Design an enzyme around this catalytic site. Structure first.
Site, PDB file in Angstrom:
ATOM      1  N   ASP A 132       1.222   3.821   1.566  1.00  0.00           N
ATOM      2  CA  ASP A 132       1.687   4.626   2.879  1.00  0.00           C
ATOM      3  C   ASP A 132       2.898   3.853   3.232  1.00  0.00           C
ATOM      4  O   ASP A 132       3.834   4.552   4.051  1.00  0.00           O
ATOM      5  CB  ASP A 132       0.738   4.652   3.688  1.00  0.00           C
ATOM      6  CG  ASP A 132      -0.069   3.273   4.145  1.00  0.00           C
ATOM      7  OD1 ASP A 132       0.060   2.570   3.128  1.00  0.00           O
ATOM      8  OD2 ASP A 132      -0.021   2.693   5.486  1.00  0.00           O
TER       9      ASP A 132
ATOM     10  N   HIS B  55       0.683  -1.170  -0.010  1.00  0.00           N
ATOM     11  CA  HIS B  55      -0.092   0.125   0.014  1.00  0.00           C
ATOM     12  C   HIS B  55       0.956   1.334   0.171  1.00  0.00           C
ATOM     13  O   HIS B  55       2.061   1.360   0.421  1.00  0.00           O
ATOM     14  CB  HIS B  55      -1.029   0.017   1.022  1.00  0.00           C
ATOM     15  CG  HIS B  55      -1.990  -1.036   1.024  1.00  0.00           C
ATOM     16  ND1 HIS B  55      -3.009  -1.428   2.051  1.00  0.00           N
ATOM     17  CD2 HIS B  55      -2.440  -1.509  -0.032  1.00  0.00           C
ATOM     18  CE1 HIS B  55      -3.787  -2.048   1.681  1.00  0.00           C
ATOM     19  NE2 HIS B  55      -3.788  -2.491   0.286  1.00  0.00           N
TER      20      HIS B  55
HETATM   21  O   LIG Z   1      -2.064   0.530   4.883  1.00  0.00           O
HETATM   22 ZN   LIG Z   2      -2.545  -1.164   3.875  1.00  0.00          ZN
END
Ligand SMILES: [O-]
Ligand SMILES: [Zn+2]
Ligand SMILES: [Cl-]
Ligand SMILES: [Cl-]
Ligand SMILES: [Cl-]
Ligand SMILES: [Cl-]
Ligand SMILES: [O-]
Ligand SMILES: [Zn+2]
Ligand SMILES: [Zn+2]
Ligand SMILES: [Zn+2]
Lengths: 233, 233
Positions: free
Chosen positions: A88, A86
């Site tokens: 982030d 992901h």
């Molecule tokens: O995340």
């Molecule tokens: Zn995630």
């Protein structure tokens, strides 16, 4: 009491918190769905250089992270690991690479990151494709507990300090409901957590993906929250 | 911009923002699920006294709200309206009542708050039982658009300043996913939003329950998010 919270950390800034000798968490505040929350990663000393765990989400924040490391620690980050795909956790990888940091992730993470259009760590971490797999990586052990927050999520253990960083597979105690579970495996998450409990029953400090650290209680708490979500609700 | 954010507002503190002559919003930061969000309410001058819309969630925060009003505006809060029964909108009613503030809510809200074990406003607002019903309440118009965030949610319009406050029935633009919808009527929410558009097409300022204000665009944004959640995003 001493651990940084969103109140101490303006959006765009990063704080470091020394958990033990040669082990820090880095904390950065992010905006999401109109809310602000503190995001944790990990820093582990290895000789006279540093191993980074996860970015600070994005180029700007990750540049701020590197600057805070130079200010507080003053040793070079030579390697970095992203715990899942992901944005982030891999967002900022390009900044790390351009600064001369060797970026790492599992083939599963790199694969998923590419599909999603996210930044892709350069190096592939082998031997983590099966649930329960553990591999040594300098001052830490990388562990794939199975699907949970994501199918590719890894956790990190620092044996010298008994520190366990769980990423978003582990919730802080203040979190009473499930976070983003769009890519999660609710059916397997509890089983994956139990693999962590079984493999690191000696862990003394548990770092969640967001929020305050605690002990191994965070595992059962996470399971409780995940199961409550499953039963809807 | 200039509207206050969570960064400018420490936890437990309240800030006021003057939207127009005799029309403010009050903003307080709450910690929930480990994240911090900025919660909006309204303040409307009526002659030489003030009308309050919604608490600041909790006795402590609501006390701070009354203190901030006294410091910044220095006119007495004589009446208060809670827009629905959830604890963040009625929590603090006991503080308001002790401070000599006459507290108001629809009979639907009072009953639902009582069931939930929440604080209960003293007075019952008649004439708001059916969708599309509007009534005047001093310097504002109260409007029941029908079930949305909750079966009882009201919105408030200030005709003098063309300010529309929607509570948690209206999302800010930064909010991409549905928040708390445990007590929501997803099926009716879009229809209720359209009642608001039809009744207040001249609205210039639209205040969401949480976060940054905007224009009437906030309405369609909310519907889009709600419908996506219905189809599961
Ligand atoms: O995340
Ligand atoms: Zn995630
Ligand atoms: Cl290399
Ligand atoms: Cl390299
Ligand atoms: Cl009264
Ligand atoms: Cl009265
Ligand atoms: O609410
Ligand atoms: Zn290399
Ligand atoms: Zn509510
Ligand atoms: Zn009265």
């Amino acid at each position: 009491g001493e651990y940084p919270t969103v109140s101490e950390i303006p959006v765009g800034e990063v704080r470091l918190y020394q958990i033990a000798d040669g082990v820090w968490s880095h904390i950065a505040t992010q905006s999401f769905d109109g809310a602000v929350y503190p995001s944790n990663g990990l820093i582990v000393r290895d000789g006279d250089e540093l191993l980074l765990i996860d970015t600070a989400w994005g180029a700007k924040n990750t540049a701020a992270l590197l600057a805070e490391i130079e200010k507080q620690i003053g040793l070079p980050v030579t390697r970095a690991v992203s715990t899942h795909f992901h944005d982030d956790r891999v967002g900022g990888v390009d900044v790390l690479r351009a600064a001369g940091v060797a970026t790492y992730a599992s083939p599963s993470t790199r694969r998923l990151a590419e599909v999603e259009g996210n930044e892709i760590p350069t190096h592939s971490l082998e031997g983590l494709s099966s649930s329960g797999d553990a591999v040594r990586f300098g001052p830490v052990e990388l562990f794939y507990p199975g699907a949970a927050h994501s199918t590719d999520n890894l956790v990190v253990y620092v044996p010298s300090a008994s520190v366990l960083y769980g990423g978003c597979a582990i919730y802080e105690l203040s979190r009473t409901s499930a976070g983003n579970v769009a890519d999660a495996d609710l059916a397997e998450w509890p089983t994956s957590i139990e693999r962590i409990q079984q493999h690191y029953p000696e862990a003394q400090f548990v770092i969640p993906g967001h929020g305050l650290p605690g002990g191994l209680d965070l595992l059962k708490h996470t399971t409780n929250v995940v199961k409550a979500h499953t039963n809807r609700s």
